[PDB]
Structures are given as structure tokens and as C-alpha cells.
Design an enzyme around this catalytic site. Structure first.
Site, PDB file in Angstrom:
ATOM      1  N   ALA B  12       0.824  -1.204   0.000  1.00  0.00           N
ATOM      2  CA  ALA B  12       0.000   0.000   0.000  1.00  0.00           C
ATOM      3  C   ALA B  12       0.860   1.256   0.000  1.00  0.00           C
ATOM      4  O   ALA B  12       0.576   2.212  -0.731  1.00  0.00           O
ATOM      5  CB  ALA B  12      -0.941  -0.001   1.204  1.00  0.00           C
ATOM      6  N   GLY B 143      -1.252  -4.727   6.532  1.00  0.00           N
ATOM      7  CA  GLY B 143      -0.177  -5.571   6.062  1.00  0.00           C
ATOM      8  C   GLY B 143       0.816  -5.879   7.167  1.00  0.00           C
ATOM      9  O   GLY B 143       0.954  -5.140   8.140  1.00  0.00           O
ATOM     10  N   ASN B 206      -9.966   2.917   3.780  1.00  0.00           N
ATOM     11  CA  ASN B 206     -10.200   2.387   2.440  1.00  0.00           C
ATOM     12  C   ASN B 206     -11.685   2.322   2.107  1.00  0.00           C
ATOM     13  O   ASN B 206     -12.062   2.462   0.939  1.00  0.00           O
ATOM     14  CB  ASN B 206      -9.579   0.999   2.302  1.00  0.00           C
ATOM     15  CG  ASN B 206      -8.192   1.037   1.694  1.00  0.00           C
ATOM     16  OD1 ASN B 206      -7.775   2.040   1.112  1.00  0.00           O
ATOM     17  ND2 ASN B 206      -7.473  -0.069   1.818  1.00  0.00           N
ATOM     18  N   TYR B 224      -7.332  -0.751  -6.493  1.00  0.00           N
ATOM     19  CA  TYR B 224      -6.295   0.016  -5.812  1.00  0.00           C
ATOM     20  C   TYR B 224      -5.863   1.202  -6.661  1.00  0.00           C
ATOM     21  O   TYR B 224      -5.595   2.288  -6.136  1.00  0.00           O
ATOM     22  CB  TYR B 224      -5.094  -0.875  -5.495  1.00  0.00           C
ATOM     23  CG  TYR B 224      -5.314  -1.861  -4.366  1.00  0.00           C
ATOM     24  CD1 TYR B 224      -6.110  -1.538  -3.274  1.00  0.00           C
ATOM     25  CD2 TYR B 224      -4.717  -3.113  -4.392  1.00  0.00           C
ATOM     26  CE1 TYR B 224      -6.307  -2.438  -2.245  1.00  0.00           C
ATOM     27  CE2 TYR B 224      -4.907  -4.017  -3.367  1.00  0.00           C
ATOM     28  CZ  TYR B 224      -5.703  -3.673  -2.298  1.00  0.00           C
ATOM     29  OH  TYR B 224      -5.902  -4.570  -1.278  1.00  0.00           O
ATOM     30  N   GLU B 254       2.674  24.885  10.411  1.00  0.00           N
ATOM     31  CA  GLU B 254       1.879  25.882  11.118  1.00  0.00           C
ATOM     32  C   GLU B 254       0.473  25.363  11.393  1.00  0.00           C
ATOM     33  O   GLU B 254      -0.096  25.629  12.460  1.00  0.00           O
ATOM     34  CB  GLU B 254       1.847  27.179  10.307  1.00  0.00           C
ATOM     35  CG  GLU B 254       1.267  28.367  11.048  1.00  0.00           C
ATOM     36  CD  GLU B 254       1.462  29.673  10.304  1.00  0.00           C
ATOM     37  OE1 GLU B 254       2.626  30.045  10.039  1.00  0.00           O
ATOM     38  OE2 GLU B 254       0.447  30.325   9.979  1.00  0.00           O
TER      39      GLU B 254
HETATM   40  N1  LIG Z   1      -5.560   2.243  -0.590  1.00  0.00           N
HETATM   41  C1  LIG Z   1      -4.783   1.191  -0.814  1.00  0.00           C
HETATM   42  N2  LIG Z   1      -4.762   0.144   0.084  1.00  0.00           N
HETATM   43  C2  LIG Z   1      -3.972  -0.931  -0.154  1.00  0.00           C
HETATM   44  C3  LIG Z   1      -3.179  -0.990  -1.286  1.00  0.00           C
HETATM   45  N3  LIG Z   1      -2.494  -2.154  -1.261  1.00  0.00           N
HETATM   46  C4  LIG Z   1      -2.839  -2.835  -0.145  1.00  0.00           C
HETATM   47  N4  LIG Z   1      -3.753  -2.087   0.546  1.00  0.00           N
HETATM   48  C5  LIG Z   1      -4.385  -2.445   1.821  1.00  0.00           C
HETATM   49  O1  LIG Z   1      -3.378  -2.836   2.742  1.00  0.00           O
HETATM   50  C6  LIG Z   1      -3.794  -3.974   3.478  1.00  0.00           C
HETATM   51  C7  LIG Z   1      -2.831  -5.126   3.215  1.00  0.00           C
HETATM   52  O2  LIG Z   1      -1.521  -4.678   3.464  1.00  0.00           O
HETATM   53  P1  LIG Z   1      -0.366  -4.623   2.348  1.00  0.00           P
HETATM   54  O3  LIG Z   1       0.228  -3.235   2.266  1.00  0.00           O
HETATM   55  O4  LIG Z   1      -0.823  -5.106   0.988  1.00  0.00           O
HETATM   56  O5  LIG Z   1       0.692  -5.679   2.952  1.00  0.00           O
HETATM   57  P2  LIG Z   1       2.258  -5.356   3.116  1.00  0.00           P
HETATM   58  O6  LIG Z   1       2.449  -3.986   3.738  1.00  0.00           O
HETATM   59  O7  LIG Z   1       2.962  -5.451   1.784  1.00  0.00           O
HETATM   60  O8  LIG Z   1       2.745  -6.468   4.181  1.00  0.00           O
HETATM   61  P3  LIG Z   1       2.923  -8.028   3.801  1.00  0.00           P
HETATM   62  O9  LIG Z   1       2.570  -8.264   2.352  1.00  0.00           O
HETATM   63  O10 LIG Z   1       2.025  -8.853   4.688  1.00  0.00           O
HETATM   64  O11 LIG Z   1       4.357  -8.420   4.052  1.00  0.00           O
HETATM   65  C8  LIG Z   1      -5.204  -4.297   3.029  1.00  0.00           C
HETATM   66  O12 LIG Z   1      -6.108  -3.714   3.937  1.00  0.00           O
HETATM   67  C9  LIG Z   1      -5.306  -3.649   1.664  1.00  0.00           C
HETATM   68  O13 LIG Z   1      -6.627  -3.302   1.327  1.00  0.00           O
HETATM   69  C10 LIG Z   1      -3.194   0.059  -2.189  1.00  0.00           C
HETATM   70  O14 LIG Z   1      -2.488   0.013  -3.197  1.00  0.00           O
HETATM   71  N5  LIG Z   1      -4.002   1.151  -1.949  1.00  0.00           N
END
Ligand SMILES: Nc1nc2c(ncn2[C@@H]2O[C@H](COP(=O)(O)OP(=O)(O)OP(=O)(O)O)[C@@H](O)[C@H]2O)c(=O)[nH]1
Ligand SMILES: Nc1nc2c(ncn2[C@@H]2O[C@H](COP(=O)(O)OP(=O)(O)O)[C@@H](O)[C@H]2O)c(=O)[nH]1
Ligand SMILES: COC(=O)Nc1nc2ccc(C(=O)c3ccccc3)cc2[nH]1
Ligand SMILES: [Ca+2]
Ligand SMILES: [Cl-]
Ligand SMILES: [Mg+2]
Ligand SMILES: [Mg+2]
EC number: 3.6.5.-
Lengths: 422, 440, 59
Positions: B12, B143, B206, B224, B254
Site C-alpha cells: 500500500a 499488512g 479504504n 487500488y 503551522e
Molecule cells: N488504498 C490502498 N490500500 C492498499 C493498497 N495495497 C494494499 N492495501 C491495503 O493494505 C492492506 C494489506 O496490506 P499490504 O500493504 O498489501 O501488505 P504489506 O504492507 O505489503 O505487508 P505483507 O505483504 O504482509 O508483508 C489491506 O487492507 C489492503 O486493502 C493500495 O495500493 N491502496
């Protein structure tokens, strides 16, 4: 990048194993010679998960074929795609198991297990980042059940931080007349409860009932039962093979370490004599479409994974998955929020425009273990056929331990079935 | 001078970072190869856009950014994407096994293997700075990397950079676009461990972004890509004051003075308008009064909650484009007569306003219409605690049965960290109630 | 100003120590978890020796 190492042991394990490679080879555009002649780049994007790229740009299954008899494996080399498998990855003996778990776990299988691990190490060390292992086998036989659980326990010693998945075929009186199958199955479940992260319960009872009642096959063959297994295994591995790893998928499906036995499901299931998104969803939640002989409405779902394949409306999939949940809310535990997840892959299976594969962690799976336990205790309280096992060096206690461990698994499923949020 | 370093963590964080830097390049006239014809000072400069971009002797404008992920597939798309020439290879850092949605693996098992290299690469960015202001950290709550590794990084940054400011853009989990079940666990764990090390955090729900894309942009099933392009616009509005300058421009620091009355109460509620498709913007000019009124429509909030049921501790309006104070003041006067805007009795009620004259841009092929003026409201309201309540409740449901906890214990964590993190959240929810009570 | 320097340094110090203790406590716990797992697997290996020994005696 994220490699899986596949193992198939025993007659059943090698049979469904060969079918699995036939089906996914077709989906990825790999011919019996190992060459790629597909039509989309999506087929090759994650082909490293299950295949090694060899000299001449030929793709070789990362597969290891094991058996205490050469019979079935000889058929594999002669059958279709027999030539893609790496010849050195055939590890067979001549003794055999005689459908005796002890012979596979302790006696005949222990003599051969080291040569199997030699091939596992050579495969694993060629992986950029090994996800883990998948094993195909039956629990009623001797090699797949006995030597399979031994291979799992010994692989875990050398790879304790890797996922161990199994496609385990449960025995049923409707398919095999062998009598000691409940013993071999109960002894195996005792092992799988401890040393696997995911076990798909491929129940022969359910496979027969589907072929007979639904597909209208008066006398189902092992090939008919296996067409269901092949389509199921293709489905549950679709998200791994086409554009999360085994660990992330186990993390969201296994709330408790011992409760990792899944009910597979597939739709559509139709006979050769004579489809909407609402109908797909309704079917995959129907007990008739479960590859395990269990009614999900006799228990509750801890977690569910569903993958839809084909061109369809994601919006409509989202609506129908929310629809079936609200109308079946009682059958989903409240204390695990958002426990039903959905995925879509644009690439459908062979011969279908749309399909759906269901992976359920349901407390109703206790019905399957209760059935095995009933057959087990009906023979062990008489001490019938026990000399086959004591003759190999086992003691009656090990039978009593495996029994009460599976009965504990049942009561553990019942505990969380009865638990509530408030 | 006043450089800001952006750190994008996990999928993300990385994918949102891609959208932000693409948008930044368009706003400043930077090409995918880093060239900026309008920049007549080659190799350096103290212009406003130099807060986010460094310059090489060859005229390349390089984001002051580090991308970090514990698996390579997401960052690989940056290495081969359209803006691949924008980043030096050392700004893109990848392992090969991710955290498998497990906070423990992101903070401990896997994260500890790469944390030293990451800090080394951030140091190299910091060394190029003449007056580093702080860090902007983008990550998901759900994540395993976004939660676990971010916490580890934040803890380490406090050690290596003292109390240099650290701002977060955090993705709050929504079931519509998530395939993970343990996200409530990862959210509470990272929020607890990061709370002391963050000066200000903008949560992005989200589900709120999902609803806005469906309702206002007529997207049937947002991806996404859809969410991130909208998120990039809000992020841009928030950082615009750092990257552009003007007489009416008010620096984000500020605004922060007003938004954070106590260290732990540092979660502003963002609201952005106008979100409108090209088809509806055609022969449609949304005035200053219309976009300002939209700021107080809860459907346009970045986090689902009801400010009408809470109390305000601060209200900031960040305008960009064709906006002059006269119209702002008129619009605000109107809203004060027709809206449920109750402040706590210990905080003044005036709205703090900034205007950046540069108009907003849109990425080609996007769904957002290009408008002449936009606004981001940043308010500190007790209503944002509703987001903690929903997440804490999902946590409690699973933790009462210890569901999935074995995955965390297996990687080295203890049950004491779960209860310790949940107790910190209970105190945070309590803190938000106490600030809303009237004085004696 | 001395008080400001002391508070910032004490914050840096306590964070450095809190983290060092967390990362070591986690290392020990994970190492113990894996050691217990293997010890259970070695115990099974020993049990397999007894089974193969119990067969030999019967012959
Ligand atoms: N808005 C948005 N949310 C995202 C995106 N990618 C993943 N998410 C959200 O992030 C969460 C999952 O975490 P990720 O960031 O994909 O996982 P990570 O940080 O790579 O960690 P791991 O893969 O478990 O090692 C879920 O709730 C997804 O909906 C994105 O590109 N945009
Ligand atoms: N579905 C299916 N089940 C099988 C097949 N072969 C054997 N089985 C089942 O597996 C059990 C026998 O185990 P088997 O694999 O033949 O023994 P092994 O060769 O020593 O591992 C019986 O309960 C059979 O119903 C097969 O090809 N397909
Ligand atoms: C070889 O053994 C395995 O393939 N293990 C395995 N576990 C899985 C769990 C889930 C899924 C999915 O398809 C899925 C569908 C919707 C949301 C999230 C995931 C696939 C899996 N495969
Ligand atoms: Ca310059
Ligand atoms: Cl790297
Ligand atoms: Mg057989
Ligand atoms: Mg990731």
C-alpha cells in the site's frame, strides 16, 4: 521466486499427482515434452512456482514421485506427460507396504525415506525463496499414509520454517473394500494434526456420492473420482499460479494450529447429460458440492476462501458473496469478523467459461473424523487385524493415543462451534 | 532547505507512493526522466519543489524518497514502470519473503534482516539535506510489512534522528478491498508501538475512499489504482504548502501547531472536495462556497465517522487553485450558520485558512475531472475515535478466543504485547473522551 | 535548554533500550519455539528406533 516443492507418495498420491500436473500443464501451456506453446503471457508469469526452467527453455515440474512399489510410477512414466517429470526424481522401492501404515511409517518406508530427502534437498536448494511443500497421498493405504506422514515429519526437521500442505484422500467403504483403512487413516490424522499447516480433506465418500448421485455414474471409476480431485486442486492453487504465498494464505485460513483441515468445494458439477454468478455462489455453499462428506449447516464456518475463475462482474461477485453471508449468517462464527474472502482470476479452467472453488474451515468437518473414529473403534475394541501392526513393532498404546487424539480434535471443533461472542 | 524525506513501506505504501510522485511530477513539470525544463538552476537550488526533489548535475530531479518492501513484486513494477528512470536503484529496497500479513514477521523475524540497510539508505538521503525537516511515512495498518516493519522503522528513526518530525499516511483497513482476516491485530499492534514516535498521522479509511469512488466517480468496483489516484490528490493538497509557495500559502507545520493539542491526539480528519467525474464537471463550475460546503458533508471524509456527534478542537482549510480570501470568508460565514460545528470550550473557534494558487492536476486516463479549485479540510475532532472503536472491537472479538494468535507467538511475540497494545488503545479512546468534556 | 537536551537524549536512550530488549526477548522466544518443535520430532525419531527394535526381538 516463490517456489513450491510437490511430492506424491503411494498409489493414490501418484495418481492424483499425475492428474494435477496434466491439468495445470494444460492451463500454463506446457506440452508432454516440457515445451511452452501457449498464447498468453499470464501463463508464464508465475510458472516458476511449480516448474523449473531448464536448458532449452523447457519447464520441468518441481515434483518428486515416491512409492514402495514401482507399479503406479511405471504407469506415470508411460502415461501422458510421463516424460516431463525429471527421471532422477523417481524414488521407488520393490518391497511395498501391503496397506500397512507401520510398514510405511516405520519399517519399509524408513529404509527409503533418506533417498527421498536427497531429492528434496536438491530441489529445495535450487529455489530462490521456497514457500513450502505440497503432498498428495491417501490416508487409507500404507505408503501414502505411513511413509507420507514420515516424510512430513522428517521434512519438518530440515525445513521447520516452511509451509507444509497436504491433499489427503480419506477412505470410504464405498470405494475400497480393504478393511484396515480406518486404522491407517486414524494413525495418519494423528500425524497431520501436528505437522501440517493446511490439509485438504479429499473425501472418497463425497467423491463417490457426487459421481453417483449428481454426475449419474452407476459405477464410478478412480478416473471419475480423480476428475473431481484434479479440478479441485487446480482451483485451490489458482491464486498461487496466476497473477499471495502459502504462508499468507494459511494465516488467513487457520485460526488455531490444530484446526487446519479444510472442506474443498467446486462448482459447477454437472453430468455429461445437459450459468449465473448467483447460481455459482449458491452451489459452492451447497453440501452437495463439498469434496468432504460433511454438511456445513451442521456446524459453523471459522474461515472461508472462495476463488471465482472466468470473465464475470466483480461487482456481481461482491453482491452475491455478501448476499449468501447475510442469508446464512448463523453458520459463520461472530468472533472472527470478515472471515469470508473472495478472489477472481480472469483465466477459466479447461472446458468452462466460469467456475468457483470453495475452501472452508468448518467445524462440520468433525462429521468426517467421527465417521473414521466409529470405524476405528469398531475394529480396535475387538483388537482385529492388530497383528499386522504389532508385527512391525507397534504397541497397542500408539493405537489408543491416535484414537484419543482424533477424538480430541473432534471435541475441539465442537468447542469453537459452541463458542459465542458474548 | 526544509527538505522532506518520504518513506513508502509495503504494498500500500509503495503503490500510493507511485501515485503521489507521478502526480508531483505533473504538478511541477517534471518528466519521467527527471528533467524539468522550467528549472534554470542546474544541479541544485533552494526552490519550493526542492523540499521533495533533489537535483543532479545532469539536471535530473530525484524524489527524496525510499521505497521498502519485504517482497520484490510491487517494487519491481517501479523498477520497470514509466517513472523507473526517476529513482536511483538504491532508493528501491526489497527482500524476497514478505511478512505474510503477520506484524511479528514485519517487526521481528523478517524486518530485522533489512532494517539496517534501510536506515543506511535513509541516511544517504539525509546527508544530501541542508536543513532536513522530517519524514513522511506511507503504510497500511493491515499488512505485515506496513504494520510491523513501519513500527520498527519509526522506533529506529526516533533513535537516529531524535525528535525530528515524522508524519504518517496510514491506510485503515476496510473489508471491501482486503483479503486478510488478522488486520485488526496488526492495526492495534502498530498503532500502539508507533504512537510515541509519530507527531501527526493522517488515516485514510479504504472504505471511505471506496465509497467516494463508487458514489462520486461512478466506478462500479474500484481498484487500488482508483483508490490511490484519489488518495494522491489529498496527499498532494496536504504537502502542496511544502512544495509550492505564495503570499497566502500556510506551511503544514503551522497547521500542525493547531491540530495537535496533546502529543497523543495527533490524528486529523481529512475531507476533500470536489470529487467529480469529467461528465458531471462539464458545464459545471464548483465555486469556493460549494467546495467548502462539501468539506462538512461526512460522505467526503477520508475516515468514516460522524463529526456531528463529536467536538472540534481545530478546523483547517487548505485551498488550492483559483481562490481568494474574500470568497473563503463568505463561504465560512455561511457554514457557521447552517452546520453542527461544536468546539470544545478550551479551544478557539476560528478556522485556519491557507491558499496555494497553483491549481490541481489530474493524471491522464484518470476518472477525476480537472477543476480550477479544490480544498482539503484538516479537522481535529473527537469523532475520529469512532474509527479506533470499530477496530478495537474487531480486535476484542478475535482475541477473546485467541484466534490466529499462534501465528504471532510462533514468530516470537507474547500475549503480553497484545494486551499491552489493546490497553494503550483503550487509554487513547479514553483520552479522546476526556478532551471533549467541558471544563470546570 | 539543558533540560530540553536532557529530555531528548533520555527519550532517545529509553527507545534504544526498549527496542533492544524487545528484539532480544523476541529472538529467545522464537528460538525456544523452534527448539521445542524439533525436540518433539527427535522424540518421534527415538520412538521409531524402539519400534524397529521391538520388531527385531519378535524375530
Ligand atoms: N488504498 C490502498 N490500500 C492498499 C493498497 N495495497 C494494499 N492495501 C491495503 O493494505 C492492506 C494489506 O496490506 P499490504 O500493504 O498489501 O501488505 P504489506 O504492507 O505489503 O505487508 P505483507 O505483504 O504482509 O508483508 C489491506 O487492507 C489492503 O486493502 C493500495 O495500493 N491502496
Ligand atoms: N480418489 C482416489 N483414491 C484412491 C486412488 N488409489 C487409491 N485410493 C484410495 O486410497 C486407499 C488405498 O491407498 P493406496 O494409495 O492405494 O495405498 P499406497 O499405495 O500404499 O499408498 C483406498 O482407500 C482407496 O480408496 C485413486 O487413484 N484415486
Ligand atoms: C498447495 O496448497 C495451497 O494451494 N494452499 C492454499 N491455501 C489457500 C487459501 C486461499 C486461497 C484462495 O484462493 C483465496 C480466495 C479468496 C481470498 C483469498 C484467498 C488459495 C489457497 N491455496
Ligand atoms: Ca534547480
Ligand atoms: Cl534491494
Ligand atoms: Mg492401492
Ligand atoms: Mg506485501
Amino acid at each position: 521466486m516463490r517456489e513450491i516443492v510437490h511430492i506424491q507418495a503411494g498409489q493414490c498420491g501418484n495418481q492424483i499427482g499425475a492428474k494435477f500436473w496434466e491439468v495445470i500443464s494444460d492451463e500454463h501451456g506446457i506440452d508432454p515434452t516440457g515445451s511452452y506453446h501457449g498464447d498468453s503471457d499470464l501463463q508464464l508469469e508465475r510458472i516458476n512456482v511449480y516448474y523449473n526452467e531448464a536448458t532449452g527453455n523447457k519447464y520441468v515440474p518441481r515434483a518428486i514421485l515416491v512409492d514402495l512399489e514401482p507399479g503406479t510410477m511405471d504407469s506415470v512414466r508411460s502415461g501422458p506427460f510421463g516424460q516431463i517429470f525429471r527421471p532422477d526424481n523417481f524414488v521407488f522401492g520393490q518391497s511395498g507396504a501391503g496397506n500397512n501404515w507401520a510398514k510405511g511409517h516405520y519399517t519399509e518406508g524408513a529404509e527409503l525415506v533418506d533417498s527421498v530427502l536427497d531429492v528434496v534437498r536438491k530441489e529445495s536448494e535450487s529455489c530462490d525463496c521456497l514457500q513450502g511443500f505440497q503432498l498428495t497421498h491417501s490416508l487409507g493405504g500404507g505408503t501414502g499414509s505411513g511413509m507420507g506422514t514420515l516424510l512430513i515429519s522428517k521434512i519438518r526437521e530440515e525445513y521447520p520454517d516452511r509451509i507444509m500442505n497436504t491433499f489427503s484422500v480419506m477412505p470410504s467403504p464405498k470405494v475400497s473394500d480393504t478393511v484396515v483403512e480406518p486404522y491407517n487413516a486414524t494413525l495418519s490424522v494423528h500425524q497431520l494434526v501436528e505437522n501440517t499447516d493446511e490439509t485438504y480433506c479429499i473425501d472418497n465418500e463425497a467423491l463417490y456420492d457426487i459421481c453417483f448421485r449428481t454426475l449419474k455414474l452407476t459405477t464410478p471409476t478412480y478416473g471419475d473420482l480423480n476428475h473431481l480431485v484434479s479440478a479441485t486442486m487446480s482451483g485451490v492453487t489458482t491464486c498461487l499460479r496466476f497473477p499471495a504465498d502459502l504462508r499468507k494464505l494459511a494465516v488467513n485460513m487457520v485460526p488455531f494450529p490444530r484446526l487446519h483441515f479444510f472442506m474443498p468445494g467446486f462448482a459447477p458439477l454437472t453430468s455429461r447429460g445437459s450459468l449465473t454468478v448467483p447460481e455459482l455462489t449458491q452451489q459452492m455453499f451447497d453440501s452437495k458440492n463439498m469434496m468432504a462428506a460433511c454438511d456445513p449447516r451442521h456446524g459453523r464456518y471459522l474461515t472461508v476462501a472462495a476463488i471465482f475463475r472466468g470473465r464475470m462482474s466483480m461487482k456481481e461477485v461482491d453482491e452475491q458473496m455478501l448476499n449468501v453471508q447475510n442469508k446464512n449468517s448463523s453458520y459463520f462464527v461472530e468472533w472472527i469478523p470478515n472471515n469470508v474472502k473472495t478472489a477472481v482470476c480472469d483465466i477459466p479452467p479447461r472446458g468452462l467459461k466460469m467456475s468457483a472453488t470453495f475452501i472452508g474451515n468448518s467445524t462440520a468437518i468433525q462429521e468426517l473424523f467421527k465417521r473414521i473414529s466409529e470405524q476405528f473403534t469398531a475394529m480396535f475394541r475387538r483388537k482385529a487385524f492388530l497383528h499386522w501392526y504389532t508385527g512391525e513393532g507397534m504397541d497397542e498404546m500408539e493405537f489408543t493415543e491416535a484414537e484419543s487424539n482424533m477424538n480430541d480434535l473432534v471435541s475441539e471443533y465442537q468447542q469453537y462451534q459452541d463458542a459465542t461472542a458474548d | 532547505m526544509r527538505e522532506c524525506i518520504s518513506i513508502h513501506v509495503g504494498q500500500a505504501g509503495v503503490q500510493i507512493g507511485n501515485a503521489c510522485w507521478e502526480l508531483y511530477c505533473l504538478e511541477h513539470g517534471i518528466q519521467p526522466d527527471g528533467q524539468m525544463p522550467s528549472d534554470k538552476t542546474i544541479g541544485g537550488g533552494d526552490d519550493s519543489f526542492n523540499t521533495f526533489f533533489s537535483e543532479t548535475g545532469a539536471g535530473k530531479h530525484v524524489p527524496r524518497a525510499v521505497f521498502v518492501d519485504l517482497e520484490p513484486t510491487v517494487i519491481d513494477e517501479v523498477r520497470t514502470g514509466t517513472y523507473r528512470q526517476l529513482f536511483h536503484p538504491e532508493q528501491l529496497i526489497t527482500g524476497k519473503e514478505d511478512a505474510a500479513n503477520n506484524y511479528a514477521r514485519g517487526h521481528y523475524t523478517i524486518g530485522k534482516e533489512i532494517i539496517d540497510l534501510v536506515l543506511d539508505r535513509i541516511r544517504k538521503l539525509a546527508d544530501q539535506c541542508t536543513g532536513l525537516q522530517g519524514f513522511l511515512v506511507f503504510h497500511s495498518f493491515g499488512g505485515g510489512t506496513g504494520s510491523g516493519f513501519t513500527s520498527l522503522l519509526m522506533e529506529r528513526l526516533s533513535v537516529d534522528y531524535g525528535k525530528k518530525s515524522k508524519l504518517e499516511f496510514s491506510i485503515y483497513p476496510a473489508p471491501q478491498v482486503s483479503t486478510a482476516v488478522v488486520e485488526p491485530y496488526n492495526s492495534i499492534l502498530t498503532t500502539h508501538t508507533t504512537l510515541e514516535h509519530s507527531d501527526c498521522a493522517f488515516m485514510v479509511d479504504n472504505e471511505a475512499i471506496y465509497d467516494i469512488c463508487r458514489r462520486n466517480l461512478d466506478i462500479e468496483r474500484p481498484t487500488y489504482t482508483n483508490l490511490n489516484r484519489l488518495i494522491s490528490q489529498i496527499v498532494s493538497s496536504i504537502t502542496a504548502s511544502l512544495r509550492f509557495d505564495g503570499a497566502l500559502n500556510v506551511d503544514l507545520t503551522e497547521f500542525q501547531t493547531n491540530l495537535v493539542p496533546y502529543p497523543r491526539i495527533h490524528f486529523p480528519l481529512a475531507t476533500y472536495a470536489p470529487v467529480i467525474s469529467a461528465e458531471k464537471a462539464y458545464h459545471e463550475q464548483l465555486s469556493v462556497a460549494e467546495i467548502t460546503n462539501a468539506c462538512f458533508e461526512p460522505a467526503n471524509q477520508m475516515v468514516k465517522c460522524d463529526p456531528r456527534h463529536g467536538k472540534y478542537m481545530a478546523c483547517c482549510l487548505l485551498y488550492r487553485g483559483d481562490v481568494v480570501p474574500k470568497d473563503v470568508n463568505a463561504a465560512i460565514a455561511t457554514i457557521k450558520t447552517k452546520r453542527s460545528i461544536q468546539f470544545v470550550d478550551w479551544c478557539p473557534t476560528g478556522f485556519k485558512v491557507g491558499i496555494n494558487y497553483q491549481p490541481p492536476t489530474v493524471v491522464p486516463g484518470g476518472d477525476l475531472a480537472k477543476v480550477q479549485r479544490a480544498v482539503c479540510m484538516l479537522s481535529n475532532t473527537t469523532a475520529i475515535a469512532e474509527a479506533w472503536a470499530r477496530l478495537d472491537h474487531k480486535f476484542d472479538l478475535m482475541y477473546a478466543k485467541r484466534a490466529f494468535v499462534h501465528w504471532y507467538v510462533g514468530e516470537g511475540m507474547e500475549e503480553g504485547e497484545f494486551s499491552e497494545a489493546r490497553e494503550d488503545m483503550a487509554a487513547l479512546e479514553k483520552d479522546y473522551e476526556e478532551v471533549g468534556v467541558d471544563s470546570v | 535548554i539543558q533540560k530540553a537536551i536532557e529530555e531528548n537524549n533520555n527519550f532517545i536512550k529509553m527507545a534504544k533500550e526498549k527496542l533492544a530488549q524487545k528484539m532480544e526477548s523476541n529472538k529467545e522466544n522464537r528460538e525456544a519455539h523452534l527448539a521445542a518443535m524439533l525436540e518433539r520430532l527427535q522424540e518421534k525419531d527415538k520412538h521409531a528406533e524402539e519400534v524397529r527394535k521391538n520388531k527385531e526381538l519378535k524375530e
